Design a protein around this ligand. Sequence first.
Ligand SMILES: Nc1ncnc2c1ncn2[C@@H]1O[C@H](COP(=O)(O)OP(=O)(O)NP(=O)(O)O)[C@@H](O)[C@H]1O
Ligand SMILES: [Mg+2]
Length: 280
Amino acid sequence: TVFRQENVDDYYDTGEELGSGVFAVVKKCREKSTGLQYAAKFIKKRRTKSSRRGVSREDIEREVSILKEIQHPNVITLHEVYENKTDVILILELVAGGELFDFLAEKESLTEEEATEFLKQILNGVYYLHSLQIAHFDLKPENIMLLDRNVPKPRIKIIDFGLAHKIDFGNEFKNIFGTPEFVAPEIVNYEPLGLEADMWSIGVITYILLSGASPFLGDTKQETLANVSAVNYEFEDEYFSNTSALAKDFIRRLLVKDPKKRMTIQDSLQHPWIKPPQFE
Ligand SMILES: Nc1ncnc2c1ncn2[C@@H]1O[C@H](COP(=O)(O)OP(=O)(O)NP(=O)(O)O)[C@@H](O)[C@H]1O
Ligand SMILES: [Mg+2]
């Protein structure tokens, strides 16, 4: 699909850099006609067919397609898309309160309530996505943003649809591989992938939220991946001694090697605790 080829600078003014990735840079911007602010994600295009620099048009179009489908309080949303010879520029809903990653770094250790307040919103967003048969495939604290970091219980939006795929046959097979710390065993082992991989990532995020420690993280990427595939984690008493047994139960039912045996997003919302890049 073609996108708007007018100069985005004719319509927006850019400001502070919000973040970046390997082939993307995200800048705060303001739309001239409305004064409204957005996050403009500039994705570098591939210069040739065989090139390894840049993102393939197929991959850019998938992210755009998926983003166009979604409207939910806990997901990022797409306003407009522009392109030029070098970039596709997604004008995204601005999430101005920083990454959950940065909040967790700056904050003292979370209470179980603080953890479940973030987690319930993540679960609601993922419920929405999975209802649409969208697997996010890159859930992790840097891909969660807070609307406003200065309130007691910050509201969040899931961002970064760069690895997201529609799962219309129950599984996909094109290996998608995110960050070792957060990927499920089926990703590590290059097996067919579905919505279950997100549920594993939620288990890892939950472990981190409650403890400030990462369940599988080793000193090298290969060590982490080996730990993930073997389900080599435990609940360290030093971090978890005042954490409830129900919270541990929730995590234990997500960090399951067999994706068929792992809790689904619906299971996770009914669970008694809740119910009211890979290479060195
Ligand atoms: N809508 C948004 N509002 C505010 N900040 C954003 C938004 N989208 C992205 N960012 C920031 O920009 C960073 C990179 O954008 P992202 O969509 O994650 O592209 P990426 O390069 O595919 N992911 P990564 O490689 O993990 O950084 C994020 O980690 C955020 O810090
Ligand atoms: Mg990202």
